[PDB]
Design a protein around this ligand. Structure first.
Ligand SMILES: *[C@@H]1O[C@H](CO)[C@@H](O[C@@H]2O[C@H](CO)[C@@H](O[C@@H]3O[C@H](CO[C@H]4O[C@H](CO)[C@@H](O)[C@H](O)[C@@H]4O)[C@@H](O)[C@H](O[C@H]4O[C@H](CO)[C@@H](O)[C@H](O)[C@@H]4O)[C@@H]3O)[C@H](O)[C@H]2NC(C)=O)[C@H](O)[C@H]1NC(C)=O
Ligand SMILES: *[C@@H]1O[C@H](CO)[C@@H](O[C@@H]2O[C@H](CO)[C@@H](O[C@@H]3O[C@H](CO)[C@@H](O)[C@H](O)[C@@H]3O)[C@H](O)[C@H]2NC(C)=O)[C@H](O)[C@H]1NC(C)=O
Ligand SMILES: *[C@@H]1O[C@H](CO)[C@@H](O[C@@H]2O[C@H](CO)[C@@H](O)[C@H](O)[C@H]2NC(C)=O)[C@H](O)[C@H]1NC(C)=O
Ligand SMILES: *[C@@H]1O[C@H](CO)[C@@H](O[C@@H]2O[C@H](CO)[C@@H](O)[C@H](O)[C@H]2NC(C)=O)[C@H](O)[C@H]1NC(C)=O
Ligand code: NAG
Ligand code: NAG
Ligand code: NAG
Ligand code: NAG
Ligand code: NAG
Ligand code: NAG
Lengths: 52, 52, 513, 52, 61
């Protein structure tokens, strides 16, 4: 919609250009929320690395 | 001024150029009269258009 | 043909007093492309919000321009007398791809009225007059600057309120002081402000009518009039010729308060213009009405590569003359200057060729010249380089010895000597540039300082002036990395200059005030 | 120095070489990047070598 | 033969002063340079055009 005439005339995104180029950008694999879940799991693993 | 930071910025820049180069090549002639098929057809007789 | 009105009925022309010493003033008004001076807007399309590199017809950076001075004529103080002009009609220049002019550069300043050097007046903008054509030669009395057949005349009139562009055969009149008569110097055009610049009624034919005193207009193919808004605004105007006609350009209609020049008219002149000159002009004012006029400056156009900076409004507000200096070549290739470091390799110094050496059994002394960098032709073998007297390597009697890369190593001459060929040597260059202080220093590497001076005659770029500002007061300093100008010996040790020179050397930036 | 590398001081060459100027721009900038990487590697390695 | 002055829009073939292509026009604000009619982008593609109706249109192909 933002690369369509039914949207802001000012859009100049390189993504909009993909509709002509035949190029596609693919999505990320994890999303921010899963990546956050993985590093919050590391934070909860701190204290500690001793006691064998 | 932080070298690790600069490297983060380059990872971004390196992906940006990979696409910018594919995109800019779409307007590049390749020894051709034009990078545009529509202009090759519009201003050239058929026996020349195929070569371009 | 075109009816351009009647011939003048005057039996004689006004005498023209050509006194070049009074116009011999110095006031350069150069093009500064960093503000896009003299830049003609590219035709066929537009862009905005972008910096591009483009090859096309542009003036070059630092061109001061040929200065054209128009002046008051002679007067008794009550009435005007004779015309007083510079020797411009004979100043025939090559048209080539066109040229540009800066009009009104001195407008609103105060200065000499020219004819009387001790007298000054507020300076006014005056539009330039030109005579152009495909062929030139002499007049019947031996004067220069005659144009043949149909000549293109660009003649502002109406005290600078209309441009008359016309193409006619100019038929010289035979009366006193006319081109085919007695006591002719140079025709010159004129207007008489006392009657011609009346407010609300300018004599729109004053300069046309004076022109007509010297030449009749015949077989005109055209005459077009353009109107000019009267103002004192600095203005760009110019001309080019293409297969489609003669293109008249100005900033006046599209960018009046800016200066980008745009095409406003095309004249149907298909005869390649090869030559042009400035029409001398004099104003028949009186001493009490003696004004000062701004000189106009003419700069040539040529196919140059520029970086052109287009603002959001599509006008070029900055440009880079890529070949002006070493740093500028880099700016075009690298877009800007604070990009990374500005510390990059730069274009090298060529060599500077000398007169040739020629030998071939089948004007002096060209048998040999030892040496520096001489052109040569030896038994059909050509190149350029320096010969050195050296010992022979074989095979004997086969004359030309070549290396591993099939290049000539040396030659057995008919004088019994063997010479080694080193081709020409050159000076590599690199620039140390600080984007923070906007300064630099440079190295010649392996050349070493025994061959280095603040000036060069090699050359690597048109100007070295950015270094000369400081380097003109220093000799070269020799370092293990290479020979450098603008180095200053401080005997310091620093961990990182952000301009390391390699090895154990570093170029330290100075401190901002 | 591409201008010299491609042709040994000939104007006809430079006139035709100009059509390809963007190529050599890529060559020098790519090498600029590689030489910087070489310098950073050397100084970063010696930095670990040095004792307090 | 009418109305082909403009059609806004979706994907229309066009010919404007010798400039050809296909696309959708959008009524939008002007970008320069004024009076040079056809505005092009970083890739030399048409961005927009100043029409004889006084309007500037953005082209999204
Ligand atoms: C300042 O200088 C300019 C120079 O351009 C003068 O402009 C010319 O003015 C003259 C008259 O003064 C014009 O000539 C006359 O034009 C009349 C009609 O013009 C149209 O039709 C003619 C047909 O030939 C075209 O050539 C012309 O371009 C127009 O399309 C004619 O009817 C007139 O004919 C009469 O006079 C002629 C002699 O001149 C006789 O031969 C005829 O039989 C008849 O009696 C005449 O041709 C001329 O066209 C204008 N030229 C241009 C280039 O525009 C300004 O008038 C002058 N201003 C001042 C204040 O002096
Ligand atoms: C000689 O003096 C005259 C008179 O002052 C100078 O002309 C003036 O130049 C300024 C600068 O361009 C003009 O300002 C412009 O106003 C417009 C209005 O919209 C604005 O859009 C521009 O951005 C700019 O601000 C001013 O209008 C103009 N005066 C007139 C009467 O037009 C002239 O430039 C001086 N000449 C020289 C050679 O110094
Ligand atoms: C352009 O003008 C020149 C001179 O005004 C013409 O050349 C003259 O031609 C005559 C023909 O008999 C010769 O007698 C003259 O000696 C020539 N003069 C010169 C200077 O060469 C020329 O023919 C004209 N060309 C056109 C196309 O009209
Ligand atoms: C305008 O054109 C006429 C012809 O239409 C020219 O008249 C001829 O000029 C040549 C010059 O050598 C003569 O040889 C011819 O005999 C002339 N023809 C006639 C019919 O007289 C006229 O000279 C041209 N005007 C100018 C100033 O060159
Ligand atoms: C004009 O006359 C002078 C007289 O010496 C001569 O030297 C010059 O070459 C002539 N020019 C032309 C174009 O005939
Ligand atoms: C210039 O302005 C005057 C004003 O009356 C007009 O008559 C004349 O035709 C105009 N000329 C041009 C070339 O626009
Ligand atoms: C120029 O580019 C900037 C990038 O943010 C954009 O916001 C602005 O609207 C652009 N202007 C034009 C005339 O395209
Ligand atoms: C220089 O020229 C002389 C000529 O006799 C020759 O004998 C000598 O060997 C040459 N120099 C060298 C380095 O060969
Ligand atoms: C700088 O001065 C010192 C003084 O001892 C000298 O040894 C050194 O060679 C000088 N370097 C240059 C480049 O002049
Ligand atoms: C739409 O067209 C009108 C016509 O007056 C114009 O004023 C308006 O600015 C245009 N829309 C945009 C986004 O510019």
């Amino acid at each position: 919609d933002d690369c369509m005439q039914q949207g802001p005339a000012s859009a100049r995104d390189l993504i909009c250009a993909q509709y002509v180029a035949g190029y596609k950008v693919l999505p990320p694999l994890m999303d921010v929320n899963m990546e956050a879940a993985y590093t919050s799991s590391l934070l909860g693993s701190i204290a500690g690395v001793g006691w064998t | 001024t932080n070298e690790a930071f600069h490297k983060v910025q380059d990872a971004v820049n390196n992906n940006a150029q990979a696409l910018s180069k594919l995109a800019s090549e779409l307007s590049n002639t390749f020894g051709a009269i034009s990078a545009s098929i529509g202009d090759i057809i519009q201003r050239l007789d058929v026996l020349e258009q195929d070569a371009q | 043909y075109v009816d351009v009105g009647p011939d003048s009925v005057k039996s004689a022309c006004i005498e023209v007093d050509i006194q070049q010493t009074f116009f011999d003033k110095t006031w350069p008004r150069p093009i500064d492309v960093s503000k896009a001076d003299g830049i003609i807007y590219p035709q066929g399309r537009t862009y905005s919000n972008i910096t591009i590199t483009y090859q096309g017809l542009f003036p070059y950076q630092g061109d001061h321009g040929d200065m054209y001075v128009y002046s008051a004529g002679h007067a008794t103080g009550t009435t005007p007398q004779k015309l007083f002009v510079a020797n411009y009609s004979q100043d025939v220049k090559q048209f080539a791809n066109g040229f540009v002019v800066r009009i009104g550069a001195a407008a609103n300043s105060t200065g000499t009225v020219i004819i009387s050097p001790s007298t000054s007046a507020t300076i006014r903008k005056i539009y330039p007059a030109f005579m152009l054509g495909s062929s030139v030669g002499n007049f019947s009395d031996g004067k220069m600057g005659r144009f043949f057949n149909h000549t293109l005349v660009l003649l502002p009139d109406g005290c600078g309120t209309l441009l008359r562009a016309f193409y006619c055969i100019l038929e010289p009149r035979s009366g006193n002081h006319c081109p085919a008569g007695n006591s002719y110097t140079s025709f010159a055009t004129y207007h008489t402000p006392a009657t011609d610049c009346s407010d609300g009624n300018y004599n729109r034919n004053a300069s046309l009518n004076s022109f007509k005193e010297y030449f009749n207009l015949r077989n005109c193919t055209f005459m077009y009039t353009y109107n000019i808004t009267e103002d004192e605004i600095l203005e760009w105007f110019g001309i080019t010729q293409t297969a489609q006609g003669v293109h008249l350009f100005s900033s006046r209609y599209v960018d009046l308060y800016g200066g980008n020049m745009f095409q406003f008219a095309t004249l149907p002149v298909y005869d390649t213009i090869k030559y042009y000159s400035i029409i001398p002009h004099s104003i028949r004012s009186i001493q009490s009405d003696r004004k000062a006029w701004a000189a106009f400056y003419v700069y040539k156009l040529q196919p140059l590569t520029f970086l052109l900076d287009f603002s959001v409004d599509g006008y070029i507000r900055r440009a880079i003359d890529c070949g002006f200096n070493d740093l500028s070549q880099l700016h075009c290739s690298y877009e800007s200057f604070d990009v990374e470091s500005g510390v990059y390799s730069v274009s090298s110094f060529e060599a500077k060729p000398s007169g040739s050496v020629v030998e071939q059994a089948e004007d002096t002394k060209i048998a040999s010249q030892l040496g520096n960098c001489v052109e040569y032709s030896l038994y059909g073998v050509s190149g350029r380089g320096v010969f050195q007297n050296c010992t022979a390597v074989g095979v004997r009697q086969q004359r030309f010895v070549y290396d591993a890369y099939q290049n000539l190593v040396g030659y057995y001459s008919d004088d019994g000597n063997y010479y080694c060929l080193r081709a020409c040597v050159s000076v590599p260059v690199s620039v140390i540039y600080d984007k923070e202080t906007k300064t630099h220093a440079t190295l010649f590497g392996s050349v070493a300082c025994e061959h280095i001076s603040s000036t060069m005659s090699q050359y690597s770029r048109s100007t070295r002036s950015m270094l000369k500002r400081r380097d003109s007061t220093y000799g070269p300093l020799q370092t293990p990395v290479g020979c450098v100008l603008g180095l200053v010996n401080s005997s310091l040790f620093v961990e990182d200059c952000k301009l390391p020179l390699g090895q154990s050397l570093c170029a330290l930036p100075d401190t901002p005030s | 120095d591409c201008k010299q590398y491609v042709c040994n001081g000939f104007q006809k060459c430079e006139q035709l070489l100009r059509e390809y100027g963007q190529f050599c721009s890529k060559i020098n900038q790519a090498l600029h990047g590689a030489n910087l990487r070489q310098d950073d590697s050397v100084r970063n390695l010696f930095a670990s070598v040095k004792s307090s």
